[PDB]
Design a binder for this molecule. Structure first.
Ligand SMILES: Nc1nc2c(ncn2[C@@H]2O[C@H](COP(=O)(O)OP(=O)(O)O)[C@@H](O)[C@H]2O)c(=O)[nH]1
Lengths: 181, 199
């Protein structure tokens, strides 16, 4: 709703709080009734705009490589680590990190679990191939960047309900926690 | 007792092994007096490499972590100087067995980065682990590749663990548990064994 001071600015007259409340209650009554187009625009004259745009993860386009295979590319960042992953529509579950198998690139089990989390959550372990390039940061930061990149790329091959579920599970959010000066 | 030496071996001015004695005596001389253990190993090798050529028996030379023989050591002198592998009698005598100058047997060996010295964790190929000297020594040889489990082997390994009741987690028998074990191990036998150990 239009605030009191900006309503004064539009009217070019000072007004109290109770009369502002009177006006707002009349506007509410007009809204509740079957207000027509003229009444709708009249209300919109006194209704300011605030944009809400959550729920909507930008789904990367599905590209096709020279071999005719469908894939999607995405980026992720965690601390100073930056990852860029290519997820293929079909595959056998092979992840390749900087050209190295994922179990050789990530000796620690925690990082392998982090890489597993996205595909496991949407019940498609062993159905996609991943080729990712990660740079900077350390062990866990690189694992988190790769996880974010794979989730954002995998959003292309899942249903919109599954995309929303991944969003709610925290799998599509860039983690902003970084070292404070 | 069947194998018998073909030379006189002198351990000390008092003690010697006379020609024609059973090889066991030599072995015993190394197990009782450790001072002559290393000399007793070489003699054994020198006998086994020779008599097999004569055709008395077939000899299998099985050496695990064979990449150690042509690399570096972490042993030092009293002046803290490095020691080379060829300066060890135990390592010097075992290199002769790797040379294909005898018949009547086979030489089977396995590389291993685990326990190796001055090799990066991801080095597994023959030249990378052996070095130039090691490859030149073993050349010509037949390399045999060992890979991760294929699906049949992985399924049978988990079935063996289930039959021994070694997977106690209630979700391990299920298909989703098997997929998670497969992803986390990537069908690697050692990783799968270590993961299954504490489940
Ligand atoms: N104490 C002692 N050791 C021996 C004797 N003969 C062989 N050996 C040991 O067994 C190994 C035989 O290796 P060999 O073929 O003779 O090579 P080489 O001695 O360097 O010429 C030697 O390294 C010795 O350690 C011996 O007559 N007395």
């Amino acid at each position: 709703w239009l605030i009191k001071e900006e309503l004064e600015e539009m009217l070019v007259e000072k007004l109290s709080d109770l009369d502002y409340m009177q006006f707002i209650r009349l506007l509410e009554k007009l809204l509740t009734s079957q207000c027509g187009a003229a009444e709708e625009e009249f209300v919109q004259r006194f209704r300011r705009s605030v944009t809400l745009e959550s729920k909507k993860q930008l789904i990367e386009p599905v590209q096709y490589d020279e071999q005719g295979m469908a894939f999607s590319k995405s980026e992720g960042k965690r601390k100073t680590a930056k990852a860029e992953a290519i997820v293929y529509k079909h595959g056998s579950g092979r992840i390749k990190v900087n050209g190295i198998d994922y179990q050789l690139y990530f000796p620690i089990t925690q990082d392998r679990e982090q890489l597993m989390f996205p595909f496991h959550f949407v019940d498609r372990l062993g159905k996609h191939d991943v080729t990712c390039t990660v740079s900077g940061g350390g062990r866990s930061a690189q694992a988190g960047a790769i996880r974010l990149a794979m989730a954002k790329a995998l959003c292309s091959f899942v249903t919109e309900d599954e995309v929303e579920w991944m969003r709610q599970a925290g799998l599509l959010t860039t983690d902003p926690r970084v070292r404070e000066r | 007792n069947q194998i018998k030496v073909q030379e006189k071996y002198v351990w000390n001015k008092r003690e010697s092994t006379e020609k024609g004695s059973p090889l066991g005596e030599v072995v015993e001389q190394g197990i009782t007096r450790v001072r002559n253990a290393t000399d007793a190993v070489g003699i054994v090798l020198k006998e086994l490499k020779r008599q097999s050529s004569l055709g008395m028996f077939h000899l299998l030379v099985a050496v695990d972590g064979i990449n150690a023989l042509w690399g570096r050591t972490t042993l030092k002198r009293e002046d803290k100087s490095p020691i080379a592998p060829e300066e060890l009698a135990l390592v010097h005598n075992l290199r002769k067995m790797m040379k294909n100058d005898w018949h009547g047997g086979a030489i089977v060996s396995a590389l291993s980065q685990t326990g190796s010295l001055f090799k990066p964790r991801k080095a597994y190929l023959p030249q990378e682990l052996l070095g130039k000297e090691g490859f030149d020594a073993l050349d010509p040889f037949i390399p045999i590749l060992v890979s991760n489990y294929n699906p049949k082997e992985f399924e049978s390994c988990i079935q063996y663990y289930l039959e021994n009741n070694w997977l106690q987690h209630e979700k391990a028998p299920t298909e989703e548990g098997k997929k998670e074990l497969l992803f986390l191990s990537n069908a690697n036998p050692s990783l799968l064994e270590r993961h299954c150990a504490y489940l």
